[PDB]
Design a protein around this ligand. Structure first.
Ligand SMILES: [Cl-]
Ligand SMILES: [Mg+2]
Length: 295
């Protein structure tokens, strides 16, 4: 119950599209989720109320589910967390981050599908003929990418590229852990009626050289969430979380031409989206979001 510090007491160190990172001390960071939401590669003007809190709750749930070491350095109510960001910020260990976007795909969609349609391959994996949109990939594929321009899409790379980034043995480890963790999480979600079609992890290494899962894990921003009840290979699957937002923006009311920066969302669309996040979280975790901490 020690008096919580102000966020202004920490040094702001980086800023992403919907996340923020603060230095707490030499060895610790504060990892903050905002209520911002992105669609069609735009951060939208309208925040989704409680999104940050809900996605934080989701990450914490999955870190608990998985056996691999992770960057969490205290509980979700740790006194080092400012009141202002309570429930949407975690106290974490500083790590030497490995510059590889560790992506697993259990299903063929997005840039993976496009690469396959162009080349017959994805990230060095030569796939069977006859696959298409939302085809199941079994075993799941390790489809690493690297971050690029401020700017552009992530660049899909092959295993050799990853070896050149982190070392042969470490690259093998990245591959193995990514597939293992995705496979476990995917089966868990599916059992609850939610497909995790793919996911992106970042790992770092601690002072001793151990691999440590960082960043956020298995959120609908880092993973494609689909409703299993409606899964049909061969057609584009709806985003579990973002479909109401997408339909509104590209629909009759928005007055926005997606083929040529989107307008604000109706409040009713934002509240409905908040409800979809809570549904995803509760169904997957078996927990109640009402028990999740807040200011
Ligand atoms: Cl993709
Ligand atoms: Mg997050």
């Amino acid at each position: 119950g020690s008096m919580r510090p102000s966020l202004s007491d920490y040094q702001h160190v980086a800023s992403g599209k919907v996340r923020e990172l603060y230095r707490v001390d030499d060895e610790h960071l504060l990892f903050v989720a905002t209520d911002r939401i992105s669609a069609f590669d735009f951060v939208l003007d309208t925040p989704i109320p409680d999104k940050g809190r809900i996605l934080t709750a989701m990450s914490v749930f999955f870190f608990g589910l998985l056996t691999v070491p992770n960057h969490l350095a205290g509980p979700p109510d740790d006194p080092r967390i400012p009141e202002e960001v309570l429930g949407r910020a975690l106290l974490v260990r500083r790590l030497d981050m490995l510059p590889v976007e560790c992506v697993a795909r259990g299903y063929l969609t997005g840039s993976g599908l496009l690469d396959y349609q162009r080349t017959g391959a994805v990230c060095g994996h030569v796939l069977p003929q006859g696959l298409g949109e939302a085809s199941r990939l079994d075993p799941p594929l390790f489809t690493p990418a690297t971050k690029a321009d401020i700017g552009e899409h992530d660049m899909n790379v092959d295993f050799a590229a990853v070896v050149g980034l982190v070392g042969a043995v470490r690259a093998n480890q990245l591959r193995d852990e990514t597939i293992k963790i995705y496979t476990r999480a995917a089966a868990h979600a599916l059992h609850k009626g939610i497909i995790l079609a793919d996911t992106k992890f970042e790992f770092g290494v601690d002072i001793e050289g151990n691999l440590v899962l960082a960043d956020e894990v298995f959120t609908p921003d880092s993973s494609r969430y689909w409703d299993a009840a409606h899964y049909q290979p061969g057609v584009v699957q709806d985003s579990f979380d973002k479909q109401f937002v997408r339909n509104w923006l590209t629909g009759p009311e928005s007055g926005w031409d997606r083929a040529s920066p989107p307008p604000p969302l109706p409040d009713e669309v934002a509240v409905a989206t908040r409800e979809r996040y809570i549904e995803a979280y509760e169904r997957i975790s078996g927990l109640s979001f009402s028990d999740w901490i807040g200011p």
